């Protein structure tokens, strides 16, 4: 579907079918630099612990 970052920015994965908006995760540490990148269809909502970060846009994360 959509192409969203890895960890690495300067490689992408492609999103699963159904799959369109790319997230990024952080910790509440470190809320400056995000740990993980994806793909996924619906947005999670923030946690105690890690907080998401969706958008619409390809390699945007």
Same mark, same amino acid.
């Given at each position: 579907?959509?192409?969203?970052?890895?960890?690495?920015?300067?490689?992408?994965?492609? !999103? +699963?079918?159904?799959?369109? =908006?790319?997230?990024?995760?952080?910790?509440?540490? #470190?809320?400056?630099?995000?740990?993980?990148?994806?793909?996924?269809?619906? !947005? +999670?909502?923030?946690?105690? =612990?890690?907080?998401?970060?969706?958008?619409?846009? #390809?390699?945007?994360?």
């Amino acid at each position: 579907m959509l192409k969203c970052n890895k960890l690495v920015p300067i490689a992408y994965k492609t !999103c +699963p079918e159904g799959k369109n =908006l790319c997230y990024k995760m952080f910790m509440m540490s #470190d809320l400056t630099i995000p740990v993980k990148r994806g793909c996924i269809d619906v !947005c +999670p909502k923030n946690s105690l =612990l890690v907080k998401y970060v969706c958008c619409n846009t #390809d390699r945007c994360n």
